[PDB]
Amino acid sequence: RRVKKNIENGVAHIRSTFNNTIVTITDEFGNALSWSSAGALGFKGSKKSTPFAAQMASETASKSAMEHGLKTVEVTVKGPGPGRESAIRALQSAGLEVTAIRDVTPVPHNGCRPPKRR
Amino acid sequence: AISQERKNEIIKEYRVHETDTGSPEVQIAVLTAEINAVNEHLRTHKKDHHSRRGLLKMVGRRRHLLNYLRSKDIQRYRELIKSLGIRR
Amino acid sequence: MRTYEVMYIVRPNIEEDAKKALVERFNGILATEGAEVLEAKDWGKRRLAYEINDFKDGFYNIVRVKSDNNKATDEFQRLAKISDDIIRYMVIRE
Amino acid sequence: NESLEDALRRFKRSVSKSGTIQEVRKREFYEKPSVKRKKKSEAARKR
Amino acid sequence: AIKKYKPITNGRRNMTSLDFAEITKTTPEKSLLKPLPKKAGRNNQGKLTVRHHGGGHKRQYRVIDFKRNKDGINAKVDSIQYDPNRSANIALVVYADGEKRYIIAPKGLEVGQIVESGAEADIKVGNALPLQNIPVGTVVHNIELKPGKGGQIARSAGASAQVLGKEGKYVLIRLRSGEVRMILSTCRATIGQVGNLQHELVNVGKAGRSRWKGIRPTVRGSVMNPNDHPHGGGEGRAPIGRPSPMSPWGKPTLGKKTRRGKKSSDKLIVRGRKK
Amino acid sequence: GITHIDYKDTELLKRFISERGKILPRRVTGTSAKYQRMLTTAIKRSRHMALLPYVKEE
RNA sequence: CUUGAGUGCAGAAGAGGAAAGUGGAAUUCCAUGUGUAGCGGUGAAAUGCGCAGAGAUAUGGAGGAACACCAGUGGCGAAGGCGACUUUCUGGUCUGUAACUGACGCUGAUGUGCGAAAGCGUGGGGAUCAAACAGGAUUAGAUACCCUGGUAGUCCACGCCGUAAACGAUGAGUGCUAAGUGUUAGGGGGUUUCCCGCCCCUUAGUGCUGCAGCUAACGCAUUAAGCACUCCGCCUGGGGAGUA
């Protein structure tokens, strides 16, 4: 530490918009360890959107998460996208011991005015 | 507003017979008090859309009843336009 | 004349001595105008579903007072903003 | 011993049952306050 | 109130005034007065230093007990009254003791009202006290900077300060000038914004009023022959050529600061915007 | 019947909300409409005193 | 004289209004921490942002907005419109009762006041959004769609303006004229050991389907576009023109 903070229960932040999905894993609070993006995995455009691109970022950062060492990991989910069910199926095979999955993608309470078009 | 107490109070002075609830001297009196109180309500609350609507309707109704009165009797009519002091 | 219920909520972290002094003080605020303090209660040490400022739980408290309509909030829900210990409040009718 | 896919299913109705999809669907772009009620005055007989 | 004088001639067209229904009495005391001369912008030497002052109406000085030193004791107001020396009206006091001392006029201060100057005083208008004993979100004025000097800030017409938060010491403020300074926690202060607020919303109407005060005419630079002012000279009218629009002793006007970085206030200020 | 709510009937509040923090509508209750109108007000008043949350998603 | 109208008596509901006062999420920004190399957006890209450390993640703070689920072909409003909560003031509506007045009523030119959004002025505040606008891309061409941003304004008070597809494309009121089915506020009767369960009747509103009748036809049909009465306003081929 502060590079090698060693734990056994962190958390996995996930988002999947309709143009991209990224992922990153940290400790409980948390603070950064690693991430990945389909645009960093070489992909582009539509391929950022695929479930397949979600899997590969999930793994390819998850390995950096077992760098310092970690088995259990909980989930955050923003960004309704297609990869939010294939990425996880990837993640169990990543060799981890997940405990919880709670969706937070906030529906506000009539606060802000969205864009108009279309 | 008014209370049902003062509502049942004023009739005592201006009822012709103790069973009375009509005898429009009743009506114009009670309503007169109301239009005043709502007048200063509307003073402190300069704007209301419903309020003055209610006043105007109370008024046209009042003067209608009053014209039935002066149509019927005049000694009364005088008597209470100088009791309540209204319509010059 | 009207039946005004009322709540107040204080921290659990104060010493109770503050809670006592604030009770007697508080109801002293209410009944002085001619209002008729009627019914008090301590709904109790109670866990919340929400962290107000940084806390977990606290003291729910109820009193009730019957009066004519222009005597209680006039100073109550001013002092509510003043009192550091006071957290939230609420006032209703029948 | 509830497999992480079964958790993916419990989570799948967690999302499908809280209506977390269709409100973002509904709030993503502006709606005039009249057009959601042309919307519901045309859904006023479909149902 | 402000008032539309209607045009009869060409110097009452666009003008306005006050109407002075904020006042009880017209005539002030004898006792608490102090005379005053007008120097009109010039040193002990005699030399003019500041341009376009001078030439006014007679007036006098009227003392104020800004410090509000006598604390805990109660008092009242007996009257409101004009003061030319300032933009804002002011309010007399008769102590329950018996002394008499002019003090400021906040918004909505009416005769018969009472006041104190003690830290026991709970938050109402005029009740002066140390700021430590105040919540957040309270508009206040006649503030101290060092204690016991007598209040200095937010003392103008109408609006005033606003407290934002607190360390135990120092203590913060948000200001009319949109900026912030950490302040001692034990300094004296008051409650309530200042009174007269439309003092900005006069249209003077003409030039004599400005002389009646007094003020007196200024002059531009694009007419002066060039010995005096940089912008001067130039046949025909003067499209100024030198950038950095100067001031008659050099030292430009526009953009350039004068706040120097060596003052002891290096660490108090934050979020400075309105300068 | 006949007064509601304010905070006093949690085994009807809990009957009439979901785990998450939202309302179960008129349909799964099938309750009358006047108690629907009173009760929803009572809910909001009971959330504002933090007896229960705006969203319990934890 | 009361059956009209109205006051009374007892009841019922209501996003009805105006002023005030709190609360939470959510966006944007900022500070701080973690931490590396992309984020973002597209039909496909770029414009843009990114080593000054972004985005992401996390704590805290700021402040402006609009107040999620409930919400319903549900309600209230004369019309526009009215949806976080509480408070102060206040109007209006329906039911049943009826003892009081005793035809006091309907319409209403002129006249008078209310009135979406846009906008103008005095000020204030100004988070999001976005005319105008700058830029990229697209296009044979694109001032446009599309992407990137951004002003006015959106927002508060006070004033003004006085229009709309202001639509039920149906003027106000009175009264009669087949049914059946729902939803809302009530009332009354029965049943039920207690109706909470349920049945029956009725008022008011509210929708749906459909006889007669009407209709050029579409279609309305007890909330009539039927049957009749009273009052107001409006039309006389189109364009020119709601113009001079």
JSON list of N, CA, C and O in Angstrom, two decimals, chain A residues 27-68:
[
{"chain": "A", "resi": 27, "resn": "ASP", "atom": "N", "xyz": [-11.84, -1.62, -3.69]},
{"chain": "A", "resi": 27, "resn": "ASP", "atom": "CA", "xyz": [-12.14, -2.11, -2.35]},
{"chain": "A", "resi": 27, "resn": "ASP", "atom": "C", "xyz": [-13.54, -1.64, -1.96]},
{"chain": "A", "resi": 27, "resn": "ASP", "atom": "O", "xyz": [-14.31, -1.17, -2.80]},
{"chain": "A", "resi": 28, "resn": "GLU", "atom": "N", "xyz": [-13.90, -1.80, -0.69]},
{"chain": "A", "resi": 28, "resn": "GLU", "atom": "CA", "xyz": [-15.27, -1.59, -0.26]},
{"chain": "A", "resi": 28, "resn": "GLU", "atom": "C", "xyz": [-15.68, -0.13, -0.38]},
{"chain": "A", "resi": 28, "resn": "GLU", "atom": "O", "xyz": [-16.83, 0.17, -0.73]},
{"chain": "A", "resi": 29, "resn": "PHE", "atom": "N", "xyz": [-14.77, 0.80, -0.05]},
{"chain": "A", "resi": 29, "resn": "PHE", "atom": "CA", "xyz": [-15.16, 2.20, 0.07]},
{"chain": "A", "resi": 29, "resn": "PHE", "atom": "C", "xyz": [-15.67, 2.76, -1.26]},
{"chain": "A", "resi": 29, "resn": "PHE", "atom": "O", "xyz": [-16.85, 3.12, -1.35]},
{"chain": "A", "resi": 30, "resn": "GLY", "atom": "N", "xyz": [-14.85, 2.80, -2.32]},
{"chain": "A", "resi": 30, "resn": "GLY", "atom": "CA", "xyz": [-13.55, 2.16, -2.50]},
{"chain": "A", "resi": 30, "resn": "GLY", "atom": "C", "xyz": [-12.54, 3.10, -3.12]},
{"chain": "A", "resi": 30, "resn": "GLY", "atom": "O", "xyz": [-12.78, 4.30, -3.23]},
{"chain": "A", "resi": 31, "resn": "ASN", "atom": "N", "xyz": [-11.39, 2.56, -3.52]},
{"chain": "A", "resi": 31, "resn": "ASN", "atom": "CA", "xyz": [-10.37, 3.32, -4.21]},
{"chain": "A", "resi": 31, "resn": "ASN", "atom": "C", "xyz": [-9.70, 2.44, -5.26]},
{"chain": "A", "resi": 31, "resn": "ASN", "atom": "O", "xyz": [-9.61, 1.22, -5.10]},
{"chain": "A", "resi": 32, "resn": "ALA", "atom": "N", "xyz": [-9.22, 3.08, -6.31]},
{"chain": "A", "resi": 32, "resn": "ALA", "atom": "CA", "xyz": [-9.01, 2.42, -7.58]},
{"chain": "A", "resi": 32, "resn": "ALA", "atom": "C", "xyz": [-7.94, 1.35, -7.51]},
{"chain": "A", "resi": 32, "resn": "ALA", "atom": "O", "xyz": [-6.97, 1.45, -6.75]},
{"chain": "A", "resi": 33, "resn": "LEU", "atom": "N", "xyz": [-8.14, 0.31, -8.31]},
{"chain": "A", "resi": 33, "resn": "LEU", "atom": "CA", "xyz": [-7.15, -0.71, -8.61]},
{"chain": "A", "resi": 33, "resn": "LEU", "atom": "C", "xyz": [-6.89, -0.82, -10.10]},
{"chain": "A", "resi": 33, "resn": "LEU", "atom": "O", "xyz": [-5.74, -0.76, -10.54]},
{"chain": "A", "resi": 34, "resn": "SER", "atom": "N", "xyz": [-7.95, -0.96, -10.89]},
{"chain": "A", "resi": 34, "resn": "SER", "atom": "CA", "xyz": [-7.84, -1.29, -12.30]},
{"chain": "A", "resi": 34, "resn": "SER", "atom": "C", "xyz": [-9.18, -1.02, -12.97]},
{"chain": "A", "resi": 34, "resn": "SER", "atom": "O", "xyz": [-10.22, -0.94, -12.31]},
{"chain": "A", "resi": 35, "resn": "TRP", "atom": "N", "xyz": [-9.14, -0.88, -14.30]},
{"chain": "A", "resi": 35, "resn": "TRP", "atom": "CA", "xyz": [-10.36, -0.78, -15.09]},
{"chain": "A", "resi": 35, "resn": "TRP", "atom": "C", "xyz": [-10.08, -1.36, -16.47]},
{"chain": "A", "resi": 35, "resn": "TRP", "atom": "O", "xyz": [-9.01, -1.93, -16.71]},
{"chain": "A", "resi": 36, "resn": "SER", "atom": "N", "xyz": [-11.05, -1.22, -17.37]},
{"chain": "A", "resi": 36, "resn": "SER", "atom": "CA", "xyz": [-10.85, -1.52, -18.77]},
{"chain": "A", "resi": 36, "resn": "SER", "atom": "C", "xyz": [-12.02, -0.97, -19.55]},
{"chain": "A", "resi": 36, "resn": "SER", "atom": "O", "xyz": [-13.13, -0.82, -19.02]},
{"chain": "A", "resi": 37, "resn": "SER", "atom": "N", "xyz": [-11.77, -0.67, -20.82]},
{"chain": "A", "resi": 37, "resn": "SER", "atom": "CA", "xyz": [-12.78, -0.16, -21.73]},
{"chain": "A", "resi": 37, "resn": "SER", "atom": "C", "xyz": [-12.61, -0.83, -23.07]},
{"chain": "A", "resi": 37, "resn": "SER", "atom": "O", "xyz": [-11.48, -1.06, -23.52]},
{"chain": "A", "resi": 38, "resn": "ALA", "atom": "N", "xyz": [-13.73, -1.11, -23.73]},
{"chain": "A", "resi": 38, "resn": "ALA", "atom": "CA", "xyz": [-13.68, -1.71, -25.06]},
{"chain": "A", "resi": 38, "resn": "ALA", "atom": "C", "xyz": [-12.90, -0.86, -26.04]},
{"chain": "A", "resi": 38, "resn": "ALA", "atom": "O", "xyz": [-12.28, -1.38, -26.97]},
{"chain": "A", "resi": 39, "resn": "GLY", "atom": "N", "xyz": [-12.90, 0.46, -25.84]},
{"chain": "A", "resi": 39, "resn": "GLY", "atom": "CA", "xyz": [-12.05, 1.34, -26.62]},
{"chain": "A", "resi": 39, "resn": "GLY", "atom": "C", "xyz": [-10.58, 1.19, -26.29]},
{"chain": "A", "resi": 39, "resn": "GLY", "atom": "O", "xyz": [-9.73, 1.58, -27.09]},
{"chain": "A", "resi": 40, "resn": "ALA", "atom": "N", "xyz": [-10.27, 0.64, -25.11]},
{"chain": "A", "resi": 40, "resn": "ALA", "atom": "CA", "xyz": [-8.92, 0.28, -24.75]},
{"chain": "A", "resi": 40, "resn": "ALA", "atom": "C", "xyz": [-8.58, -1.15, -25.13]},
{"chain": "A", "resi": 40, "resn": "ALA", "atom": "O", "xyz": [-7.40, -1.50, -25.19]},
{"chain": "A", "resi": 41, "resn": "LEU", "atom": "N", "xyz": [-9.58, -1.98, -25.38]},
{"chain": "A", "resi": 41, "resn": "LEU", "atom": "CA", "xyz": [-9.38, -3.32, -25.91]},
{"chain": "A", "resi": 41, "resn": "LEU", "atom": "C", "xyz": [-9.31, -3.34, -27.44]},
{"chain": "A", "resi": 41, "resn": "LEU", "atom": "O", "xyz": [-9.45, -4.41, -28.05]},
{"chain": "A", "resi": 42, "resn": "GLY", "atom": "N", "xyz": [-9.10, -2.19, -28.07]},
{"chain": "A", "resi": 42, "resn": "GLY", "atom": "CA", "xyz": [-9.00, -2.09, -29.51]},
{"chain": "A", "resi": 42, "resn": "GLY", "atom": "C", "xyz": [-10.32, -1.88, -30.22]},
{"chain": "A", "resi": 42, "resn": "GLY", "atom": "O", "xyz": [-10.32, -1.34, -31.34]},
{"chain": "A", "resi": 43, "resn": "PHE", "atom": "N", "xyz": [-11.43, -2.28, -29.62]},
{"chain": "A", "resi": 43, "resn": "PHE", "atom": "CA", "xyz": [-12.72, -2.20, -30.28]},
{"chain": "A", "resi": 43, "resn": "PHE", "atom": "C", "xyz": [-13.14, -0.74, -30.46]},
{"chain": "A", "resi": 43, "resn": "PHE", "atom": "O", "xyz": [-12.53, 0.19, -29.93]},
{"chain": "A", "resi": 44, "resn": "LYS", "atom": "N", "xyz": [-14.23, -0.55, -31.22]},
{"chain": "A", "resi": 44, "resn": "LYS", "atom": "CA", "xyz": [-14.74, 0.77, -31.55]},
{"chain": "A", "resi": 44, "resn": "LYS", "atom": "C", "xyz": [-16.24, 0.66, -31.81]},
{"chain": "A", "resi": 44, "resn": "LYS", "atom": "O", "xyz": [-16.81, -0.43, -31.80]},
{"chain": "A", "resi": 45, "resn": "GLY", "atom": "N", "xyz": [-16.86, 1.82, -32.03]},
{"chain": "A", "resi": 45, "resn": "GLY", "atom": "CA", "xyz": [-18.23, 1.95, -32.50]},
{"chain": "A", "resi": 45, "resn": "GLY", "atom": "C", "xyz": [-19.24, 1.02, -31.86]},
{"chain": "A", "resi": 45, "resn": "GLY", "atom": "O", "xyz": [-19.46, 1.05, -30.65]},
{"chain": "A", "resi": 46, "resn": "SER", "atom": "N", "xyz": [-19.84, 0.18, -32.70]},
{"chain": "A", "resi": 46, "resn": "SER", "atom": "CA", "xyz": [-20.78, -0.81, -32.20]},
{"chain": "A", "resi": 46, "resn": "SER", "atom": "C", "xyz": [-20.10, -1.81, -31.27]},
{"chain": "A", "resi": 46, "resn": "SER", "atom": "O", "xyz": [-20.71, -2.24, -30.29]},
{"chain": "A", "resi": 47, "resn": "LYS", "atom": "N", "xyz": [-18.85, -2.16, -31.55]},
{"chain": "A", "resi": 47, "resn": "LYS", "atom": "CA", "xyz": [-18.20, -3.22, -30.80]},
{"chain": "A", "resi": 47, "resn": "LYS", "atom": "C", "xyz": [-18.00, -2.82, -29.35]},
{"chain": "A", "resi": 47, "resn": "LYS", "atom": "O", "xyz": [-17.91, -3.68, -28.47]},
{"chain": "A", "resi": 48, "resn": "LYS", "atom": "N", "xyz": [-17.94, -1.51, -29.08]},
{"chain": "A", "resi": 48, "resn": "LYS", "atom": "CA", "xyz": [-17.98, -1.05, -27.70]},
{"chain": "A", "resi": 48, "resn": "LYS", "atom": "C", "xyz": [-19.26, -1.48, -27.01]},
{"chain": "A", "resi": 48, "resn": "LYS", "atom": "O", "xyz": [-19.29, -1.64, -25.79]},
{"chain": "A", "resi": 49, "resn": "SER", "atom": "N", "xyz": [-20.33, -1.67, -27.78]},
{"chain": "A", "resi": 49, "resn": "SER", "atom": "CA", "xyz": [-21.64, -1.96, -27.24]},
{"chain": "A", "resi": 49, "resn": "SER", "atom": "C", "xyz": [-21.87, -3.44, -26.95]},
{"chain": "A", "resi": 49, "resn": "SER", "atom": "O", "xyz": [-22.82, -3.76, -26.24]},
{"chain": "A", "resi": 50, "resn": "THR", "atom": "N", "xyz": [-21.03, -4.31, -27.46]},
{"chain": "A", "resi": 50, "resn": "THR", "atom": "CA", "xyz": [-21.40, -5.72, -27.44]},
{"chain": "A", "resi": 50, "resn": "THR", "atom": "C", "xyz": [-21.32, -6.28, -26.02]},
{"chain": "A", "resi": 50, "resn": "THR", "atom": "O", "xyz": [-20.58, -5.77, -25.19]},
{"chain": "A", "resi": 51, "resn": "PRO", "atom": "N", "xyz": [-22.08, -7.34, -25.73]},
{"chain": "A", "resi": 51, "resn": "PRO", "atom": "CA", "xyz": [-21.80, -8.09, -24.51]},
{"chain": "A", "resi": 51, "resn": "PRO", "atom": "C", "xyz": [-20.41, -8.67, -24.53]},
{"chain": "A", "resi": 51, "resn": "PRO", "atom": "O", "xyz": [-19.74, -8.74, -23.48]},
{"chain": "A", "resi": 52, "resn": "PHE", "atom": "N", "xyz": [-19.94, -9.08, -25.71]},
{"chain": "A", "resi": 52, "resn": "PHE", "atom": "CA", "xyz": [-18.62, -9.68, -25.84]},
{"chain": "A", "resi": 52, "resn": "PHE", "atom": "C", "xyz": [-17.54, -8.72, -25.36]},
{"chain": "A", "resi": 52, "resn": "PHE", "atom": "O", "xyz": [-16.64, -9.12, -24.60]},
{"chain": "A", "resi": 53, "resn": "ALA", "atom": "N", "xyz": [-17.63, -7.45, -25.75]},
{"chain": "A", "resi": 53, "resn": "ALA", "atom": "CA", "xyz": [-16.67, -6.47, -25.26]},
{"chain": "A", "resi": 53, "resn": "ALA", "atom": "C", "xyz": [-16.77, -6.26, -23.76]},
{"chain": "A", "resi": 53, "resn": "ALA", "atom": "O", "xyz": [-15.79, -5.87, -23.13]},
{"chain": "A", "resi": 54, "resn": "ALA", "atom": "N", "xyz": [-17.95, -6.50, -23.18]},
{"chain": "A", "resi": 54, "resn": "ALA", "atom": "CA", "xyz": [-18.08, -6.36, -21.73]},
{"chain": "A", "resi": 54, "resn": "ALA", "atom": "C", "xyz": [-17.31, -7.46, -21.02]},
{"chain": "A", "resi": 54, "resn": "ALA", "atom": "O", "xyz": [-16.62, -7.21, -20.02]},
{"chain": "A", "resi": 55, "resn": "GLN", "atom": "N", "xyz": [-17.42, -8.68, -21.54]},
{"chain": "A", "resi": 55, "resn": "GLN", "atom": "CA", "xyz": [-16.73, -9.82, -20.95]},
{"chain": "A", "resi": 55, "resn": "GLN", "atom": "C", "xyz": [-15.24, -9.58, -20.88]},
{"chain": "A", "resi": 55, "resn": "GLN", "atom": "O", "xyz": [-14.59, -9.83, -19.86]},
{"chain": "A", "resi": 56, "resn": "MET", "atom": "N", "xyz": [-14.67, -9.08, -21.97]},
{"chain": "A", "resi": 56, "resn": "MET", "atom": "CA", "xyz": [-13.23, -9.04, -22.10]},
{"chain": "A", "resi": 56, "resn": "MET", "atom": "C", "xyz": [-12.63, -7.96, -21.23]},
{"chain": "A", "resi": 56, "resn": "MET", "atom": "O", "xyz": [-11.52, -8.12, -20.71]},
{"chain": "A", "resi": 57, "resn": "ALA", "atom": "N", "xyz": [-13.34, -6.85, -21.06]},
{"chain": "A", "resi": 57, "resn": "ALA", "atom": "CA", "xyz": [-12.91, -5.84, -20.11]},
{"chain": "A", "resi": 57, "resn": "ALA", "atom": "C", "xyz": [-13.04, -6.36, -18.69]},
{"chain": "A", "resi": 57, "resn": "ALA", "atom": "O", "xyz": [-12.16, -6.14, -17.85]},
{"chain": "A", "resi": 58, "resn": "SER", "atom": "N", "xyz": [-14.14, -7.09, -18.43]},
{"chain": "A", "resi": 58, "resn": "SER", "atom": "CA", "xyz": [-14.38, -7.64, -17.10]},
{"chain": "A", "resi": 58, "resn": "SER", "atom": "C", "xyz": [-13.24, -8.54, -16.67]},
{"chain": "A", "resi": 58, "resn": "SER", "atom": "O", "xyz": [-12.66, -8.36, -15.59]},
{"chain": "A", "resi": 59, "resn": "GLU", "atom": "N", "xyz": [-12.90, -9.52, -17.50]},
{"chain": "A", "resi": 59, "resn": "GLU", "atom": "CA", "xyz": [-11.76, -10.38, -17.23]},
{"chain": "A", "resi": 59, "resn": "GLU", "atom": "C", "xyz": [-10.47, -9.58, -17.18]},
{"chain": "A", "resi": 59, "resn": "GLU", "atom": "O", "xyz": [-9.77, -9.58, -16.16]},
{"chain": "A", "resi": 60, "resn": "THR", "atom": "N", "xyz": [-10.17, -8.87, -18.26]},
{"chain": "A", "resi": 60, "resn": "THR", "atom": "CA", "xyz": [-8.84, -8.29, -18.45]},
{"chain": "A", "resi": 60, "resn": "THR", "atom": "C", "xyz": [-8.50, -7.27, -17.38]},
{"chain": "A", "resi": 60, "resn": "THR", "atom": "O", "xyz": [-7.31, -6.98, -17.18]},
{"chain": "A", "resi": 61, "resn": "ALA", "atom": "N", "xyz": [-9.49, -6.72, -16.68]},
{"chain": "A", "resi": 61, "resn": "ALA", "atom": "CA", "xyz": [-9.22, -5.96, -15.46]},
{"chain": "A", "resi": 61, "resn": "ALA", "atom": "C", "xyz": [-9.30, -6.82, -14.21]},
{"chain": "A", "resi": 61, "resn": "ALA", "atom": "O", "xyz": [-8.58, -6.57, -13.23]},
{"chain": "A", "resi": 62, "resn": "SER", "atom": "N", "xyz": [-10.17, -7.84, -14.21]},
{"chain": "A", "resi": 62, "resn": "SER", "atom": "CA", "xyz": [-10.31, -8.71, -13.05]},
{"chain": "A", "resi": 62, "resn": "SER", "atom": "C", "xyz": [-9.00, -9.39, -12.70]},
{"chain": "A", "resi": 62, "resn": "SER", "atom": "O", "xyz": [-8.70, -9.61, -11.52]},
{"chain": "A", "resi": 63, "resn": "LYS", "atom": "N", "xyz": [-8.20, -9.70, -13.72]},
{"chain": "A", "resi": 63, "resn": "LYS", "atom": "CA", "xyz": [-6.90, -10.31, -13.46]},
{"chain": "A", "resi": 63, "resn": "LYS", "atom": "C", "xyz": [-5.99, -9.33, -12.72]},
{"chain": "A", "resi": 63, "resn": "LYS", "atom": "O", "xyz": [-5.31, -9.71, -11.76]},
{"chain": "A", "resi": 64, "resn": "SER", "atom": "N", "xyz": [-6.03, -8.06, -13.12]},
{"chain": "A", "resi": 64, "resn": "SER", "atom": "CA", "xyz": [-5.34, -7.04, -12.35]},
{"chain": "A", "resi": 64, "resn": "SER", "atom": "C", "xyz": [-5.92, -6.87, -10.96]},
{"chain": "A", "resi": 64, "resn": "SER", "atom": "O", "xyz": [-5.26, -6.30, -10.09]},
{"chain": "A", "resi": 65, "resn": "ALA", "atom": "N", "xyz": [-7.16, -7.30, -10.75]},
{"chain": "A", "resi": 65, "resn": "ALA", "atom": "CA", "xyz": [-7.74, -7.23, -9.42]},
{"chain": "A", "resi": 65, "resn": "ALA", "atom": "C", "xyz": [-7.23, -8.35, -8.52]},
{"chain": "A", "resi": 65, "resn": "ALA", "atom": "O", "xyz": [-7.01, -8.13, -7.33]},
{"chain": "A", "resi": 66, "resn": "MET", "atom": "N", "xyz": [-7.04, -9.55, -9.07]},
{"chain": "A", "resi": 66, "resn": "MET", "atom": "CA", "xyz": [-6.32, -10.57, -8.32]},
{"chain": "A", "resi": 66, "resn": "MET", "atom": "C", "xyz": [-4.82, -10.36, -8.32]},
{"chain": "A", "resi": 66, "resn": "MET", "atom": "O", "xyz": [-4.10, -11.20, -7.77]},
{"chain": "A", "resi": 67, "resn": "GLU", "atom": "N", "xyz": [-4.33, -9.29, -8.95]},
{"chain": "A", "resi": 67, "resn": "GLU", "atom": "CA", "xyz": [-2.94, -8.90, -8.80]},
{"chain": "A", "resi": 67, "resn": "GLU", "atom": "C", "xyz": [-2.57, -8.79, -7.32]},
{"chain": "A", "resi": 67, "resn": "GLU", "atom": "O", "xyz": [-1.77, -9.57, -6.81]},
{"chain": "A", "resi": 68, "resn": "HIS", "atom": "N", "xyz": [-3.15, -7.81, -6.63]},
{"chain": "A", "resi": 68, "resn": "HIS", "atom": "CA", "xyz": [-2.91, -7.67, -5.21]},
{"chain": "A", "resi": 68, "resn": "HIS", "atom": "C", "xyz": [-3.60, -8.76, -4.40]},
{"chain": "A", "resi": 68, "resn": "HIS", "atom": "O", "xyz": [-3.25, -8.97, -3.24]}
]
